Every structure is written in structure tokens, then in C-alpha cells.
Design a protein around this ligand. Structure first.
Ligand code: CU
Ligand code: CU
Lengths: 125, 382, 105, 382, 125, 105
């Protein structure tokens, strides 16, 4: 895989770094540590505040806003690591910036990074 | 990184389900999952991570080859898993400035579906034994109400931890003996420098009562740090460096030595065959079968991985199978249900290979299990 | 405490009555840096854009606990009824640079 | 990765010395070593470890390609190194139970030869910004007496830590700006959302004095998270996604924006070339040169490793050199001395590649640098 | 590469796991993280008590007792990991047991494992 | 504390006087595990094997601090002067199965 080529989304495997909702993921796919696509693993704490990215779904031709909420309060999972950066801006535009630990709002004030969920918020149109 | 077949199936079925939700216009509402109810095919993998100051446990569905949860630990923790699936726990060690500063030893009990801690019990004066991980250095009693852990220095001792009341009780002074195989709320056996076992029975207070067995092995015969013990069977299965296997029946709370059994043939032994690995032996209670990791190796590479597993009837010593594993395996264990899985962990690949115990076939695997995973723990739910 | 919450969760913009005190949210900004209401007034924030936003008052502001409002999607709304005179600061949780203030008179 | 060339030659030179000592009856008397004195070729490699709760710093003699020491840290800590060689420090975060429980942010200061902590300074209310490591999110004042760190949430703020008195001083409320480029004992610049710069002068106590400059870039021109900043020169070098470079000289104590430079030719830009990486830009003070990791890539692959380094005159903007590094490089820095090294860090190989900056030629390499090394830090001692 | 083959000691390279003094080293070679063959790295604490092993020096044909003293108070170095077990006995003979963190007696009661040194404490056999 | 330490560290055993009070160490044993002395007497341990050994009194025995002696290599020695009456148990640090006892009358 050419690291430098245009990123190509698929809609066939959520555990792979080129799954379509993973367009601006940074960290680890929660599905790989007992979470699911859009839910956190047991024992971890779910952020309410995140960076977002609009990601193109090849199955339906629509762009959707993905909210990359982190699951927090656990050491990093070490499993299914990925870093994509579609539309990703530097830290002075935090709302689209993905090196940040998007743990704000998690229960118990958890701020360590475990993994990242890829839920849809709505249309990016 | 590299995806197992089990991962692809699962990640593909998960992709399709999500497409179906998005099509039906069903909104994503993020929440925190619970793991499924513990079952016979739940398997835990602990990663001591080659002596890292922080470590991880992976909770895995062995039937599916899925990571269903994880639990964090500090420095060289000791994992335990209640046989009835009611809780999991470890004895762990942290420091105030990563690997230096004040040391806290503590026991944490977790709920096995939510994985939340339900107790955090400090152990006064840092008394845990820091050693590459031996499952029988920290042990539950049969009712799960007590955790015993070994102390090495300054003197041999066993700590009593009341899990039900969530309090450290006391240190019991013991002879120069190692490992803890509990048989009751207040009785446990240990293996001694002199080749005897010690039975240790303790009250509420006072010095324990200590009863030694006959010496059961000579001094030039070396008993591995990873024996198998079925608490429900009271079977202690202890291999030596050469694949000789001592069995002690502790089911009565007194030790009845069983005939020795050679896991390897004289021919194999003349040909350089010996056990080697970490968790070198497993025992299946209902089938009464021993599984031992073996290969051809020099006599002092006893910690290296093996590529084979021999299976033997524990009652007769008759060989039932010899499996070629397909990988470098450090640790084995089995599930305790009727048609058990055979778990085979590679510390170098950081992968759990899951095999059919009967035919030896690799069914599925689970990779990316930390830095140096070494310990496999199962519940004996039956 | 110092406010009550009419609705736990966000709700549809179309829900907001005509005379209602409204802070619109658009291009990463609250509508007013500083809204003035009376004791007993309900303020409703309405997210007009796709980017999710909320309102969040740190601990000690509206009582002992933080009031972290729920994230509002496009065309969602969220109200707070202010029960005590005073000045109350808030920000949007993911977006520290979005800051507002309610002045309750 | 196994054994580099520098390791083999260092490890055999070692084995001879030891063998002579033995042959000559010279007993082994173990002690704790000291690191050589801080010189210009001493390089720090910080390993954020892919967001692991505990991290490591590698202290490297870049001349020999030898690890002279290490420093442990917490979760995403921020390394600073005094230009004058007198100490190193970091701002770090720990939790009472590995990755959960009570959080402590603190500043440690270390003796740069004993590596012993000489200060442990706790930051109240956990104010550090937890972000993948940006060297200029935590900074020393030119006198080495104050450490400044960025707080992102609940509101923008900069913490003032008295290293001399070994005490946290206070938080300074700041406008909606990021990164911290100190120019005086009492003054620093930040970069703002609107595209301006803030100057912040702060006294003992009171509201700090904050002026703004004009907006120097378009909203759709994206300035990277890793600019190069020479504090002695007061040169701030800021690439965009396209390789266009904003320079600001801050030597006077006020912001003088210099003519914009393009680091890629118009041809290169149309043939897909872009900068990409983590620390994508370096700046050598004596030579007024700028180094930049560049390669052919889709626009939104800006954090992927690059195989090329273009070198250009900071005044004229004229290219001097283009090297093919021959590895996947994430980070570059330079030693600040006369014929400097080009440090080239591969996060993927976990290896620091050590280059002649003059030729672009690879001289040596240091591998096994933790799990996900991203950050190269040197001192400007001249 | 053949993990099961008899150990074959050399006396030319201390940073390799086949250097003759490393015959019962568990962990990491201190020389790789700023210590030396027989000294701890700057910032770490040197244990006094340890396991031992007789290691055959192929240079002079003589067996030497090595005291595998850990350097302590630091997270594991990660550099030069080795596990050799020449003559290594189970834990009920700790004098020769190498799974133990031999850190006891270190300054500041340091007990974490960083690396191991290979000093001679006499002759054997 | 209840004892002082002639030498902090181990010293060559040719420096111990003949007829000095000596517990020798050999075969994973203190050769006199129960030693009787009088108040004021200096005990010297001397290691007769390649296996390093020490003496280690736990916290509260000889002072509030534990005394964790240096490890004696072969033919090194280490002394404690016992300044007060009573029985003082000890053991060897990596070999906690090696136990001794000094009776100070
Ligand atoms: Cu917002
Ligand atoms: Cu001893």
C-alpha cells in the first residue's frame, strides 16, 4: 500500500483503515477492542466532544459528517491502529484537527486515549 | 496491520450491518458496550509486555476470535478469574512517577460484563513478589471470597486478601516454599525448596498450621514454574524439564501422589525432545487430559517456544495425540467444556492461535495482543 | 442552584415559540457574546449549521456540578431557565474559542 | 530491526576492553554511570508511543550514534531542552491507576548528566493540553527560568512555571491562539484562529498585555503544527500544506513578517510534490537555512512520511539541495553547530537516521527507539 | 535464528544476546541504554542482590559466575532484549532463577526493571 | 540504634583477625546460624564461596531502618558491632531461606 497515494474509501470492512467512515481517524478502531463502529468498549468512557470530518461514502455517493469521539480512560488499545487526515486542518482550527485527544466530556473525566468510534452525525451538504 | 480471517468476516459483517442502518436512516447513538456474559469459551490473555511498567489483559471470545474487552494493569500483575464467571481480579503494582517514586500494590476486582472495578484494595507495605508472571503466585479460594498472593522478600509469606469484605487481612508466615494451590477457604498447598509440598491451614488469627509431604522429587529433577492446577478437580499437574509429570491429587485437602507419567517417549528423549515455553502444560478436568508443549531443544532452552503439543490420558499416561502447531507457541490452555478449544499463544507473534483440542486444527486466531503476551486464563464454569 | 433545564435532550428548532429569546449558532460563533435576560427567562440556543455545538458552564457556575449541555445537530435547540441574577459564562465543549455569557438581571 | 553498524563497532570495541580488563585481573565493581557533558551533537528523541499512557525519551550522542541515557515520562509529555546545556525538563501527566483515576500534571526538571530529577512541580487542576506532541506547546523563556505551557480547554490559557523557585506561578488567559514562542523573560508569541499573531507580555501578577499583529495568511492557507523556531535568532519558520513558507523575525521583540518563500517549484507543485510528516521543517541558525520533508502525495496525506528533504536559503528562498533520504522519515531536526547533522526519524522503523547535512548522506543510525518516536530536540549551544 | 539450538557464546560483541556473559540474562543489555557491560545507565538504581549463572568464556576456556544485577527504577529500556537460561533453575531455587526482578537493595528501594548488567563475581565449575 | 557498622562495604577477609567472632558462609548457609555474643562484640560474616551473600535485618531489629548489608563476593567479610542486648534475626537478601540469629547477652 502506497502511504502517499490518495486515500480510497471502501464500505466493506470496518476493521480496515480504508473503511469510509475512518477518513479522519487518528488512533485505533474501537471495533477492534470490544467496542463497535459507533460504540465504546466496556470499561472505557465516551467523549461527547470531538473533531469531525466529512467523509464520502462510496456505497451511496453522499458525504456524511463523522464525529470522531474517543473512548477514554484506558491505555491505548494497540489494535487496528490508523491515521487518516481527509480535510484535516492544523490545531488552530480544532474542530477539524485530529492529533488532539478528543476525550472532553467523557464520564469520570477520563482523558487517556483508548480508541476512536466513527459514528455519523448527519449530512455534510 | 495484517488482518486475520476472523477479523475480515467480523469486520465485513459489521460493515454490512452499518450500511443497512444508514440506508434505513437509523441514527447512530453512541453508548458504552457491555461484554457478553462469561461462558466456557471466554479466554483471557495477559501481556507482561517484557517487564514494562504498564501492562494489558485482553478478554477474548474464543468461539468467535473476538476481543470483547480489555483491562489495564501496572507492573507484572497477577491475574485471577473466578471459575463461576462472577468476577475477575488481579494483584497489581503502580508507582507515582511511572517506574519510580512511591510504590502501591493493590488488588482490583472487576465486573466481568461491564469490566468496571468493584474493589480496589491496597496491600500494606508493597508485599507483592515481582516476577515474570506465574499464575499460581496469586490464587483464589474455591468460594472466591479470598485472594492469596505470594511474598518472597524479606521472608516467605502469603498475603490474605478478603475480597468479599474488600480488605487486606494479614500476611501468613510460611516455610521456604513457592506457589499457592488453595483447596478451601483456609487451606492451601505450596511447593518447597526441599521437594516436599507444604499444606498450610490458617485460622482467623495466629500462626498457620504447616504439614509437609514426603519429598516427591530429587534435587536434580527440575519442576517448572508453570504447573497446571484444576481447583475443582484438586489435580496438580507438575512437569519437570524432561517432560516427566508428577500428579498430586489435593481433592481431599491432603496430598495423594499419583503415579508419574512420562509425556515423552525414551526414543523422543534420546532424540532431544523436551517441554519448553512459559505455560507449558494444560489440564482438562472433565476429559482428564494433559497437554504439554514440546520440541527438540538443547537442555537449557527450556523457555523458548515449541511447535508441538502432546496430549495424554492423565490416568494411564497413554499418548492420545501429538499435534504440530504451525507456529511458535509459548503458552497453552484449554476451555473446560465438552469439546474444548486448545489455546496456543505466541509471545513473539503476539497472537493467540485457537485450535480444536481433539484434532489439533487451527480454527481462527487473534493478533495484536500487546508487546509480549504470555498468560492464558480460562474459567472452569461446568 | 442557578438554572433549571426545560429539556434534558436537544430538540427541533421548529419547536421554539415565536417570542422566545434565541441565540443562533452559525459559522462557529454564538449569536451574541453577551445576552441579557431577566430572572426567570428561558434562553434557547439554536444550532443553524452542520457542525455540532453545545453550551457548557463550568462547575460552580450554575451550581456545584458543571452543566455540560447536549451536543446539538443542525436545526436542533436547547434551553436553560435562569433562576438567579448574576453573570454566567459558557463555551462549546469541543470549541473553547466559542464563548458566551448570560447576564441575568 | 536488529544491530546497526555503529552498534556492532561500539559493541565489539566494548567486548575487547572488557576482555583486557578480565585478562589483566581488573575486578568488576558496578556503579551508576553519568552521561557525557551536553554538547552540540547531543540529540533527544521523544517517543509519544502512539498515545500510550507511559512514554520514553532517548538521549543520544549523535556523533557516535550512541544512547547515552533515557528519561521516562507520562502520557503525551512535552520535552524542553535548555539551549545552554544546563538542564532538561518536561511537562508530563500520570494517573493513579495507569490510565484512569486521579490525574496529576507536573513539571520535572533533570540534571542533563546525572539525569536525576532536580525539580518536581505539580500543575494544579490538570491544565496541560493532551495532543500528539508539538514541541512549541511548551517552552522555556530565553533566561531558562520559566516554563510556559498551553491549556486548550476549558478556555485558552498559558501556564507560567517558575523553574528557578520550583513553583507553579499562574494561568494567563489568552485569546484564541496556539503554540508559545517566547522572545524575552516576560514575552511570547502565539498563533491565532483569525491568522494573526498575539504578543503576550506578562508580569509578576495582573492581566498580561496582549497585542495583535495583522492577519498574515488566508483562512484557506494551512500553517502546520510543527513550525521551526530558533529562539536565539528569533526566527519563526512556518510551512503550509503546499510548502509555501511564512517567516517572522521576532529578534526585535516585535513581529516582522518577511517575504513569503515557496519551498517547492511551480513544476513540483503541479507534479504532486507537497511537504508531509510530523516535524516537517528544520531551520539552522548559523547558516540561515530551512530544511523540509517533501515528497509526491495527495493533498490530504500531509502526516505521512516523506523520502526527500529540500534545503533552501531562508533569505533568498533559493534551493541549495534536495536529498533522497532512502527511508520513510517523519521528523527532521539539525544540530546547531558549524557542519551540522541532519537528524531523520522514522516513526515506522523506530530508528533515528543520522545524516551529514552538507551532503545529505547517511552516516549512521539508532534503532529500537521505543514504539512510535516522533520528536527530535537539540540544544543551540553556540 | 534457531531459538531451540544449544547456546553458542562469543567474546566479540556485548550488545548481542550471544555474548558469553549474557548466558542467563533475562531482560535487556544495559550497554544499549547508556550503561555499560557492568554499570547502570545514568538515572537508574543499581541492585545489590541477584540471580547468578556460570558462563563459559570461550576466550580463555574458563567458567565465570555472573551476578545478573538489575538496573532499576525505570521502565524497561526496549533495546537489546535477551532471554538466556544457561543452568537456570525454577523459582524454588531463586539463587539461579531469572524470571525474578533482581532489584532488591537498589537505591531509593527501586523495584522496576530497566536492564541487566553482566559483572563477574568469581570462577565456577 | 542497636549496632554500628565497622565498614559500610565488604572488605577482604585477610583483614579479619584470627579469633575474631566469625560466622562463615558456604553451601547456601550461614555456618553458625545461632551465634551468642556479649554486648560490645563485633561479629564478622565471611563469604567462603563464589555465590554472593549478605546479612539483612528487617526494619525494627537493629534500628527503625532495615540493615540490608552489601553483598560479599568470595572471601570478603562484613562486620556489625552489637551495642545492645537481645536476639537479632537475619537472612540473606536474594536467598531468604538462608537465616541467622545473633544472641547478644
Ligand atoms: Cu461549537
Ligand atoms: Cu545468600
Amino acid at each position: 500500500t502506497d502511504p502517499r497515494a490518495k486515500w480510497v474509501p471502501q464500505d466493506n470492512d470496518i476493521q480496515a483503515c480504508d473503511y469510509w467512515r475512518h477518513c479522519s481517524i487518528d488512533g485505533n478502531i474501537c471495533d477492534c477492542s470490544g467496542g463497535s463502529l459507533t460504540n465504546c468498549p466496556p470499561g472505557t468512557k465516551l467523549a461527547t466532544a470531538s473533531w469531525v470530518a466529512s467523509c464520502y461514502n462510496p456505497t451511496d455517493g453522499q458525504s456524511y459528517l463523522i464525529a470522531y469521539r474517543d473512548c477514554c480512560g484506558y491505555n491505548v488499545s494497540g489494535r487496528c491502529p490508523c491515521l487518516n487526515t481527509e480535510g484535516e486542518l492544523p490545531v488552530y482550527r480544532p474542530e477539524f484537527a485530529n492529533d488532539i485527544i478528543w476525550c472532553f466530556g467523557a464520564e469520570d473525566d477520563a482523558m487517556t486515549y483508548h480508541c476512536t468510534i466513527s459514528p455519523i452525525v448527519g449530512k455534510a451538504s | 496491520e495484517a488482518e486475520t480471517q476472523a477479523q475480515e468476516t467480523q469486520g465485513q459483517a459489521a460493515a454490512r450491518a452499518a450500511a443497512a442502518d444508514l440506508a434505513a436512516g437509523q441514527d447512530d447513538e453512541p453508548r458504552i458496550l457491555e461484554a457478553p456474559a462469561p461462558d466456557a469459551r471466554r479466554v483471557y490473555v495477559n501481556d507482561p509486555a517484557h517487564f514494562a511498567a504498564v501492562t494489558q489483559q485482553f478478554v477474548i471470545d474464543g468461539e468467535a476470535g473476538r476481543v470483547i474487552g480489555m483491562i489495564d494493569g501496572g507492573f507484572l500483575p497477577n491475574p485471577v478469574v473466578a471459575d463461576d464467571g462472577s468476577f475477575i481480579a488481579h494483584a497489581s503494582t503502580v508507582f507515582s512517577r511511572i517506574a519510580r517514586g512511591e510504590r502501591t500494590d493493590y488488588v482490583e476486582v472487576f465486573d466481568p460484563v461491564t469490566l468496571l472495578p468493584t474493589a480496589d484494595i491496597e496491600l500494606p507495605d508493597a508485599p507483592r513478589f515481582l516476577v515474570g508472571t506465574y499464575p499460581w503466585m496469586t490464587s483464589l479460594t474455591p468460594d472466591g471470597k479470598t485472594l492469596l498472593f505470594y511474598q518472597f522478600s524479606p521472608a516467605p509469606a502469603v498475603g490474605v486478601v478478603d475480597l468479599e469484605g474488600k480488605a487486606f487481612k494479614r500476611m501468613l508466615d510460611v516455610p521456604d516454599c513457592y506457589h499457592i494451590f488453595p483447596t478451601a477457604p483456609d487451606t492451601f498447598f505450596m511447593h518447597c525448596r526441599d521437594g516436599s509440598l507444604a499444606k498450610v491451614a490458617f485460622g482467623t488469627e495466629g500462626t498457620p498450621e504447616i504439614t509437609h509431604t514426603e519429598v516427591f522429587h530429587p534435587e536434580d529433577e527440575f519442576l517448572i514454574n508453570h504447573p497446571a492446577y484444576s481447583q475443582k478437580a484438586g489435580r496438580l499437574v507438575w512437569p519437570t524439564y524432561t517432560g516427566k509429570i508428577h500428579q498430586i491429587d489435593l481433592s481431599s485437602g491432603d496430598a495423594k501422589f499419583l503415579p508419574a507419567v512420562e509425556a515423552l517417549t525414551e526414543a523422543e528423549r534420546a532424540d532431544g525432545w523436551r517441554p519448553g515455553g512459559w505455560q507449558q502444560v494444560a489440564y482438562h478436568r472433565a476429559l482428564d487430559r494433559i497437554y504439554l508443549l514440546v520440541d527438540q531443544r538443547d537442555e537449557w532452552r527450556h523457555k523458548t517456544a515449541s511447535r508441538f503439543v502432546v496430549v495424554l490420558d492423565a490416568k494411564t499416561g497413554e499418548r492420545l495425540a501429538k499435534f504440530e502447531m504451525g507456529h511458535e507457541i509459548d503458552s497453552i490452555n484449554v476451555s473446560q467444556d465438552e469439546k474444548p478449544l486448545l489455546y496456543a499463544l505466541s509471545t513473539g507473534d503476539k497472537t493467540l492461535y485457537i485450535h480444536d483440542a481433539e484434532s489439533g486444527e487451527e480454527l481462527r486466531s487473534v493478533n495484536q495482543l500487546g508487546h509480549g503476551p504470555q498468560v492464558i486464563t480460562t474459567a472452569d464454569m461446568g | 442552584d442557578k438554572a433549571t433545564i426545560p429539556s434534558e435532550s436537544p430538540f427541533a428548532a421548529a419547536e421554539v415559540a415565536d417570542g422566545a429569546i434565541v441565540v443562533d449558532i452559525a459559522k462557529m460563533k454564538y449569536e451574541t457574546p453577551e445576552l441579557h435576560v431577566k430572572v426567570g427567562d428561558t434562553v434557547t440556543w439554536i444550532n443553524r449549521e452542520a457542525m455540532p455545538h453545545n453550551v457548557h458552564f463550568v462547575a460552580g457556575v450554575l451550581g456545584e456540578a458543571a452543566l455540560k449541555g447536549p451536543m446539538m445537530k443542525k436545526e436542533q435547540a436547547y434551553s436553560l431557565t435562569f433562576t438567579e441574577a448574576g453573570t454566567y459564562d459558557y463555551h462549546c465543549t469541543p470549541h473553547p474559542f466559542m464563548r458566551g455569557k448570560v447576564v441575568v438581571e
